[PDB]
Design a protein around this ligand. Structure first.
Ligand code: HEM
Ligand SMILES: [Xe]
Ligand SMILES: [Xe]
Ligand SMILES: [Xe]
Ligand SMILES: [Xe]
Length: 154
């Protein structure tokens, strides 16, 4: 699915991102929760937060951002090993289906926010090939997470 060069474009850009994983990741989630306030129903500590300035300072928000960034780091760094990606994404899917009861579509929506922010951040380094690489990564995340929701009885 993801070629050699496409793998390499994602990984090179991800390294640039992860050098401020903590600022990037919360910026993403703040944006996500601002533009899709429904998604915040699942988080006890900020379900009623509206202020972005407060959302950015919330430890539970920040924890989720660090955890999402950690999981995707595992996926991005191991794109060459398809079964480490399957297992990471299956743990995540199942957890979200069963522990957290999160509608799968919020994965789609979050991913779209991720892509918006990566495009903004690397606007001067986002040629078609690189857009394609990220699009396939996004699509692969959604398959495995969807497949996991089915496997568990959603
Ligand atoms: C790339 C997508 C995502 C990844 C990789 C991810 C990953 C994780 C991880 C690793 C954890 C900690 C382990 C666990 O409790 O399962 C977690 C917790 C959690 N996640 Fe996600 N997540 C993603 C998207 C979402 C979305 C879209 C929502 C809902 C809109 C969500 C809601 C939650 C909730 C409610 C928790 C428990 C938070 C807490 O205990 O404070 N996640 N997630
Ligand atoms: Xe994130
Ligand atoms: Xe990602
Ligand atoms: Xe990201
Ligand atoms: Xe993504």
């Amino acid at each position: 699915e993801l070629s050699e060069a496409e793998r390499k474009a994602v990984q090179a850009m991800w390294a640039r991102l992860y050098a401020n994983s903590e600022d990037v990741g919360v910026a993403i989630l703040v944006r996500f929760f601002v533009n899709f306030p429904s998604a915040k129903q699942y988080f006890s500590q900020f379900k009623h937060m509206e202020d972005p300035l407060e959302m950015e300072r919330s430890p539970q928000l920040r924890k989720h951002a660090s955890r999402v960034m950690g999981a995707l780091n595992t996926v991005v760094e191991n794109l060459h090993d398809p079964d480490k990606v399957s297992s990471v994404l299956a743990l995540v899917g199942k957890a979200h289906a069963l522990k957290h009861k999160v509608e799968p579509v919020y994965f789609k929506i979050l991913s779209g926010v991720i892509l918006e922010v990566v495009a903004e951040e690397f606007a001067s380094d986002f040629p078609p090939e690189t857009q394609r690489a990220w699009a396939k990564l996004r699509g692969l995340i959604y398959s495995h997470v969807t497949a996991a929701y089915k496997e568990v009885g959603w």
